[PDB]
């Protein structure tokens, strides 16, 4: 995935071949591990973009993306 930013915050452009794998990227505050559980398809015009909240010792609820060290934005296409 391509690591960029959105208003100072880290942003992940996730491609199709990353479905099912732990997303890791270094940050001043250590290594960040986001988990993507998404309709994740091929990167195209039909993108969706939203935030993966920070979750410390809390079970996830009503979400398919979350990181454990620093909240991150994520973007991926839905095409197939």
Partner 1 sequence: GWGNGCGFGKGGIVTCAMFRCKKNMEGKVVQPENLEYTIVITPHSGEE
Rule CB under 8 A: which residues touch partner 1? 19-20, 36-40, 64
* Backbone torsions φ then ψ of 35, nearest 5 degrees: -120, 120
Q: Which is nearer to partner 1, 32 or 36 (CB)?
A: 36
Q: Which is nearer to partner 1, 9 or 60 (CB)?
A: 60
* Closest approach of partner 1 to the CB of residue 64, in Å: 6
Of 36, 10, 11, 13, which Cα lies nearest the Cα of 23? 36
C-alpha distances (whole Å) from 9 to each of 5, 29, 73 are 5, 13, 7
* Closest approach of partner 1 to the CB of residue 37, in Å: 6
């Amino acid at each position: 995935f391509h690591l960029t930013t959105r208003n100072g915050e880290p942003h992940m452009i996730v491609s199709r071949q990353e479905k099912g794998k732990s997303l890791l990227f270094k940050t001043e505050d250590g290594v960040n591990m986001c988990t993507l559980m998404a309709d994740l398809g091929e990167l195209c015009e039909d993108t969706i973009t939203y935030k993966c909240p920070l979750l410390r010792q809390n079970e996830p609820e009503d979400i398919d993306c979350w990181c454990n060290s620093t909240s991150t934005w994520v973007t991926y296409g839905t095409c197939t």
